[model samples]
Target: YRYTGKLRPHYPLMPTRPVPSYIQRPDYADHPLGMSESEQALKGTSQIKLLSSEDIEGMRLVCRLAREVLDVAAGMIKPGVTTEEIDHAVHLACIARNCYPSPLNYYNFPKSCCTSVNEVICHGIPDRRPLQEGDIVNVDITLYRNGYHGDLNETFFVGEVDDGARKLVQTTYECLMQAIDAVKPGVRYRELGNIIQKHAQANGFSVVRSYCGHGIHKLFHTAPNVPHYAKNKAVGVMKSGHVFTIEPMICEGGWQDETWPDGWTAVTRDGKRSAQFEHTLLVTDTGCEILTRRLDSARPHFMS
Candidate 1:
């Protein structure tokens, strides 16, 4: 059992929802099967574009809504809830808010939102599998609006989880928090790897190296590909108006990971548990602003 039932990703992901004609979709959504050639090309590594004042304000609004969408999906996390149902709830919420579900059709991802359970690190497609008691899952949400994109995710307890699962989730989240606080104008991106990997290793955790964070703005994924492992040679300097994500994936077993045939879902190599947390942030004159942070940003009540 390579997966070892630690928590395997359910198969046969649900079909993509067709956004109503009236819904305003981003340019990428027009291509239902995959992204366009231009979208596939990465930009802004040598010279990161500082967003305009208007664009920054747009990011604030879109990021706020992204947090709301993620929170709504989190409320649906119970023993019998299927991942598809959670995605539907998220889709409706986005539609009602007049925003587009960024994940739909972007690079051929069918689901509107990502649902990663236990060993699945990120990009787990939403499926029909019903969650069981004591399972841990991560719901990733990204919303598109006014030519901007917002992204974030949090791992949650399905019900009552074991000590090992609890530790991995909490530690992964703290790595994001600590790494985020380290953001400020003029700091190097590689500094984030140092902090993220250091905190994770200190807590008896291993930092996953395969999937790193990306810059989120007009395009879903952009500049400053951020790796969570320390001593990484990541380029770019933090500056005001530079918006990106600081997502750290920490594991209870080996740091190495492998992707499923689906081409998006990533799982731990040792079939052990893993956890992750993500926040789209903006580097400011002082420190970074957590665009997707909640007022009650503290851990779920169960962690107490």
Candidate 2:
């Protein structure tokens, strides 16, 4: 089902790249003026507390389920596969592991997973649209097991894509990996923005300022909203046993973004393409552990 009905004009600061004529406008439109204003008002006032060892274990199990689901769904990504087909793959993967797809019922989202295609940011509900060559798609998979949730996503290249698109995807992945690498006890939570933004800007891209990563454990979203941009005041210390995600949404053009009326789907305001990669991590005594690390057998792309 289509979430939003209003589509706003692209922002002036966004990158202007020519897209194929067949690329239609997203089904979900832009948010109303008042709604956008209100959403912006709520920022940085909350923080999710650090998790305990037992809590981290529970989250790890859910993270495993999420990773397996991503591996299974990503395998089905080829020419002609429907987004609904990807959703089916995700649902069955969750069931095989005896876990629930956290997004299936929460807030009435119908799909078991989110399949956001080119120019679509996050929360693109699965539909009948078939995967095509050169398409950039992001599969956001979250699973709940043992009373905890694991969240992660990565943008995939459907077939042979252009250099610009490939660079955007690779650079976005690097940004997230670097940010996670910087995590350790005594590190300031806000420092993540500086590290991520520096890498993005140096690569001629911009980080999305509208949506930041968040604390996740027993709850899907909690405190310490981790902003991926520079010079933001995000509170909290990266202490032992802290669990969170450092997914950075990198835009190929201007960093500005716009939300669909559906209140879920976000896209680059310039209509320029974007890419993202995420990992759910747990801070240990010495460093951090990537809970969603994929095994060799589960690799997404086939390198020559």
Best by lDDT: 1
Tens digit of per-residue lDDT, candidate 2, span 1-304: 3322222322221121122223221111123221223223444456546777788788878898798889787788788988877887787787777776767645545567788877776787776677888888899998867768799897888878889888888888888888998999999889998999999999999899888888777666666689999999888888787888888988888887777765667877777888888898888878899888875654434221
Q: Which pairs clash in model 2?
A: 4-262, 6-29, 6-30, 29-261, 47-223, 47-224, 48-223
Give the C-alpha miss distance for residue 255 in model 2, angstroms: 1.5
lDDT of all predictions: 0.85, 0.75
- What lDDT does model 1 reach? 0.85
275 Cα displacement, candidate 1 (Å): 0.6
User: How much does candidate 2 score in TM-score?
Assistant: 0.83
| Model 1, residue pairs in steric clash | none
106-175, model 1: which lDDT tens digit per residue? 8888879999987888898888889988888999999988888999998989888899988888888889
